[PDB]
Amino acid sequence: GFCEVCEKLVGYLDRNLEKNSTKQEILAALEKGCSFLPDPYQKQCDQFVAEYEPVLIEILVEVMDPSFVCLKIGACP
Amino acid sequence: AGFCEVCEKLVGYLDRNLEKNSTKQEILAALEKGCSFLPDPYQKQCDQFVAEYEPVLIEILVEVMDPSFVCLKIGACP
């Protein structure tokens, strides 16, 4: 499913965003992050972000740990 | 609609490069290698689409391989 791409994208966000970024900044980064993942991921990534944006922003404000985040949103089962 | 675009590319690839009266085993084989021939940005999405729809993809691809119709019938599009 979306598990591995989720961890890769949230991994990017964690390393390249700051600890207390605004939902707005989380959104801007989230909608630009797929382009920095390895090429074979880029389309899968956009789909994941599209299906999951609402829940992703709601959780990333609290915590940006790739393993936890992807688990919580059900992306990693 | 999230798998719609990649469905059509993949079934499109198979439509051009596979013979009309191919066995299920040959289509299975084509299908599980097809993603590697799509543009790199589609690879992991294609792998996911295939894994998710493979049973019904084989079922239909023996009868018809038109990308637009096949993706409509299986629920990938539109």
Curated annotation (Swiss-Prot), chain A:
Disulfide bonds join 3-76, 6-70, 34-45. Glycans are attached at residue 20. This is Saposin-D. Changing residue 47 to P: In PARK24; associated with disease susceptibility; affects the intracellular trafficking, resulting in endoplasmic reticulum retention; cells carrying this variant show accumulation of autophagic vacuoles, impaired autophagic flux and alpha-synuclein/SNCA aggregation. Residues 1-77 form the Saposin B-type domain.
